[PDB]
Design a protein around this ligand. Structure first.
Ligand SMILES: N[C@]1(C(=O)O)[C@@H]2[C@@H](C(=O)O)[C@@H]2[C@H](O)[C@H]1CSc1ccc(F)c(F)c1
Ligand SMILES: *[C@@H]1O[C@H](CO)[C@@H](O)[C@H](O)[C@H]1NC(C)=O
Length: 503
């Protein structure tokens, strides 16, 4: 099964239609697969009826299933390229998973095929020596580490402990954080990692490790949802008071804060900022297995979601209408990637084919290099189906990374039941309404400020510790010594004595 829609230019598409033994393909991914695949189809449908976006050129599709596996994505992604090894794939919209996009980016570069991922967030994909044909509507997770460092440097939380989940996400994220911390003069009290299958009592060890240096109340979490939950419970179980500053791993999930509400309180969490797209909800909820023949996996998905069968007769009776619709996090990015391609091709067409709306000879075939370098990257448009309020834009930096805009959430105790409130955002600079954070807003006691050392006295000079540069002991100058610097005393002589003001 492969999805093929006839068009003048054809877009390839990659979605993890199935989850990952001899089986590359398991259950239907009803949200990251079916919902996002249907969103690309939805976008094409609209582009194809839009008179300002390629009126003459009809966009086709050749959609493939990655099966949430790089190797299965590559076998499939061969379809895209054999069209040059007689209509070709003009550009690929896809890779949900980063490993999936890296695999497909390594193949498409050899055929100058532009590619826009709508979910691959690996910092690795920003390397244009490797991925020169790759852009993404979603920004790398290394941007949320920059924002985290900006939060601590604002609250002046200089001595902080850091926790990272074992993987590409945890390791690369925390590394970018430490780098942004060092340039903002923030010291890592204790670096910590959290492996895959760590036991209930194992995660409790990590809490005692962070408490070994108890002067740092701020814990910077760059963990996966699974770890951020198990660590929060091992913090509550041992009853540990921590000022969490977490990544979108934790995000604004009611799932992460389970039973450990009081322990999670005051936590600052970052979460990639999206909105539900208009019209897709009713597009999707109106899909039925009889009329949606074009999507080969729709009948497969139907039987899954409603737990019915074609032979069992009671299958058509259901509708995606009866079940309340929850629009997948990255739907917005899918549709922006499809429009970023539709626009790039449109602008290229406006430049190469000025005497016709028809696809001219200068674009038969499309030079993918000219398409990626001169049109995909230079795209700048008002995001399609954006909320009526917003003036949300679609553009890419030099490396094709999405323009990184995130939401900041604090954990609150509503008068009782515990919730998350958006306190600020990170556009290209941190912004946050401090009156919306409870441990700041009423000036109810001093800030939770985490520092290893408090400042030295008048008669004291701060002697720094050979290790960490943010730590010092308060050593006093001899009575025959005055305070020259703030880390150095000096002899007054032989007959001379220091001034009552350490001068
Ligand atoms: N951005 C992804 C990528 O593959 O780069 C892509 C997502 C998608 O298509 O929804 C898949 C993965 O979930 C994610 C891994 S990064 C990641 C971010 C937040 C976490 F909490 C976590 F644990 C890992
Ligand atoms: C952080 O430190 C600066 C410089 O001492 C100070 O002006 C600022 O008010 C501090 N911010 C907070 C919120 O503590």
């Amino acid at each position: 099964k492969v999805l093929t829609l006839e068009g003048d230019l054809v877009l390839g598409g990659l979605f993890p239609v199935h989850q990952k033994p001899a089986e590359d393909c398991g259950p239907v991914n009803e949200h990251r697969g079916i919902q996002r695949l249907e969103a690309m189809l939805f976008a094409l449908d609209r582009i194809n009826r839009d008179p300002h976006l390629l009126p003459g050129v009809r966009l086709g599709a050749h959609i493939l299933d990655s099966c949430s596996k790089d190797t299965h994505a590559l076998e499939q992604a061969l379809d895209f390229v054999r069209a040059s090894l007689p209509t070709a794939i003009t550009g690929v919209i896809g890779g949900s998973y980063s490993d999936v996009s890296i695999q497909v980016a390594n193949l498409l570069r050899l055929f100058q095929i532009p590619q826009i991922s709508y979910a691959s967030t690996s910092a690795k994909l920003s390397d244009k020596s490797r991925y020169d044909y790759f852009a993404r509507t979603v920004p790398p997770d290394f941007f949320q580490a920059k924002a985290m460092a900006e939060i601590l440097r604002f609250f002046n939380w200089t001595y902080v402990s850091t926790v990272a989940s074992e993987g590409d996400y945890g390791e690369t994220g925390i590394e970018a954080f430490e780098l942004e911390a060092r340039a903002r003069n923030i010291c890592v009290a204790t670096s910590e990692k959290v492996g895959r299958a760590m036991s209930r009592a194992a995660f409790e060890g990590v809490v005692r490790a962070l408490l070994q240096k108890p002067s740092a109340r701020v814990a910077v979490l760059f963990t996966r949802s699974e770890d951020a939950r198990e660590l929060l419970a091992a913090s509550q179980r041992l009853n540990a008071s921590f000022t969490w500053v977490a990544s979108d791993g934790w995000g604004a999930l009611e799932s992460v804060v389970a039973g450990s509400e009081g322990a999670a309180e005051g936590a600052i969490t970052i979460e990639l900022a999206s909105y539900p797209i208009s019209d897709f909800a009713s597009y999707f909820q109106s899909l039925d297995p009889w009329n949606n023949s074009r999507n080969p996996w729709f009948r497969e998905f139907w039987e899954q979601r409603f737990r019915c069968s074609f032979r069992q007769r009671d299958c058509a009776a259901h509708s995606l209408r009866a079940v309340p619709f929850e629009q997948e996090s990255k739907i917005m990015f899918v549709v922006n990637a499809v429009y970023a391609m539709a626009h790039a091709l449109h602008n290229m067409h406006r430049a190469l084919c000025p005497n016709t709306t028809r696809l001219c000879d200068a674009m038969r075939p499309v030079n993918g290099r000219r398409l990626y370098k001169d049109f995909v990257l230079n795209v700048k448009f008002d995001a399609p189906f954006r909320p009526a309020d917003t003036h949300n834009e679609v553009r890419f930096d030099r490396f094709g990374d999405g323009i990184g805009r995130y939401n900041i959430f604090t954990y609150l105790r509503a008068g009782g039941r515990y919730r998350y409130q958006k306190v600020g955002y990170w556009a290209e600079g941190l912004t946050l309404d401090t009156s919306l954070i409870p441990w700041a807003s009423p000036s109810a006691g001093p800030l939770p400020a985490s520092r290893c050392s408090e400042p030295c006295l008048q008669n004291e000079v701060k002697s720094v510790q050979p290790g960490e540069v943010c730590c010092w002991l308060c050593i006093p100058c001899q009575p025959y010594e005055y305070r020259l610097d703030e880390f150095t005393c000096a002899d007054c002589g032989l007959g001379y004595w220091p001034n009552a003001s350490l001068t």
